[PDB]
Amino acid sequence: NRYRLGRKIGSGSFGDIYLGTDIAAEEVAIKLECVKTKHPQLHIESKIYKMMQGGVGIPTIRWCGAEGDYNVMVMELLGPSLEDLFNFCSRKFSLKTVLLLADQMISRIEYIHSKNFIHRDVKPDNFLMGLGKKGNLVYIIDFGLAKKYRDARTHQHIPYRENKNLTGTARYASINTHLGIEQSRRDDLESLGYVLMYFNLGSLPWQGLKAATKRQKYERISEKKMSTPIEVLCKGYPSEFATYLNFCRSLRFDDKPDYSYLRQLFRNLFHRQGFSYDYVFDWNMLK
């Protein structure tokens, strides 16, 4: 109930992230926002976490408020991110681990969409494993770029818009995001498709391109994504990864994705491969 701030561990969408301690009991994670910021957002994000509360893989917020020069949000401590675990696993995941992760990540995105929001920054850093009895559970974090895509009462979808600035991480952004189109449900899922192929490959082919300014930088990434057919991107990997991406790329702006179809693709592959659904990930094998 009273919190000690520890080392800074990084930065979220709109603030810095810290390890901390609840001195009376337990270790926590703490996000800070300057209270004098011109674009306050931490309390908005807190309310989204609250709307999401109780979902599988949705982190619990312990306290939000103001102290000194900061707005403060305290979260239950979670385990390593999927990017951290990727590094710990020598930047290679077995097919079994990719498929286990795919099943849960699709479900996390579906859940957020069911609560009327799109995430808009699907990337490995925003998925964290739980701890203790939740160690086999993938959590999704960070609603700082999240947006409501439909009305809570009528479910009327937001309108189509063009010439929008790229929101999120360029590496995993959808093609339509690069082309300036308003993001919708389909784009969260397309980004996940790039995340899965990133886990398969160790890098994506639009990493490390040269340019002068950040504007051109994103342009080069856009051009490489558009000019790399899915069959080339996914060459040498099971067809399901291409099928997944083609499905996502083919969705209409306001389509409700068939999340079950996408999970079934990978589940059927998992079964054909003879894998056991025992939640044993590559990092559980580290000695």
Ligand SMILES: COc1ccc(OC)c(CCC(=O)Nc2cc(-c3sc(/N=N/c4ccccc4)nc3-c3ccc(F)cc3)ccn2)c1
């Ligand atoms: C017990 O021994 C340990 C040993 C080493 C450790 O690590 C060095 C740890 C710490 C594990 C940990 O990170 N746990 C954690 C993190 C968060 C995050 S992570 C994030 N952004 N990450 C990125 C990454 C890349 C790019 C952008 C952002 N934001 C929030 C967050 C969000 C809201 C909030 F209120 C508080 C925190 C939430 C809960 N647990 C432990």
